[PDB]
Amino acid sequence: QELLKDYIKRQIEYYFSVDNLERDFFLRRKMDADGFLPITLIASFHRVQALTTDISLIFAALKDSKVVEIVDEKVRRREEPEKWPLPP
RNA sequence: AAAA
């Protein structure tokens, strides 16, 4: 599933890009104070769900990333994640 | 779901 994993990885990395985060108020409101978001929330986003509903594949796509980091069931931008959370 |  390497090709599909690459598309998934790059799609999710876009959500965690600075360009997207500057405008993505929904994503920032779902962040905890340390910037973490449930991976299953990301899995529900339409462009990811179109590609797969296989949660292990999504996890595998994200371990291959230099943009995001995973802790247990959550994911955040590696660089200055505390910059981004917003009040509900 | 203006790539939430």
Residue numbers in the entry: 323 to 410
What text does the study give?
LARP1 plays a role in regulating ribosomal protein synthesis and stabilizing mRNAs and has a unique structure without an RNA binding RRM domain adjoining the LaM domain. Unlike the other LARP proteins which contain an RRM domain, the LARP1 LaM domain functions as a standalone RNA-binding domain with specificity for poly(A) RNA. High-resolution crystal structures of LARP1 LaM with six different RNAs: A5G, A4GA, A3GA2, U6, and (RP)- and (SP)-diastereomers of a phosphorothioate derivative reveal the molecular interactions that allow for plasticity in base recognition while maintaining specificity for the RNA 3´-end.
To test the importance of the phosphate group, we prepared A6 with phosphorothioate modifications at the 3´-terminal nucleotide and determined the structures of their complexes with LaM at 1.2 Å. The (SP)-diastereomer switches the positions of the oxygen and sulphur in the phosphothioate group and has a dramatic effect on LaM binding. The low electronegativity of sulphur atom makes it a weak hydrogen bonding acceptor and its larger atomic radius displaces the ribose away from Phe367. The sulphur disrupts hydrogen bonds and shifts the ribose away from Phe367. (D) ITC shows the (SP)-phosphorothioate binds with 60-fold lower affinity. We took advantage of chiral phosphorothioate derivatives to demonstrate the helix dipole and hydrogen bonds to backbone amides are major contributors to binding affinity. The strong chiral selectivity we observed opens the door to controlling the stability of synthetic RNAs through stereoselective phosphorothioate derivatives.
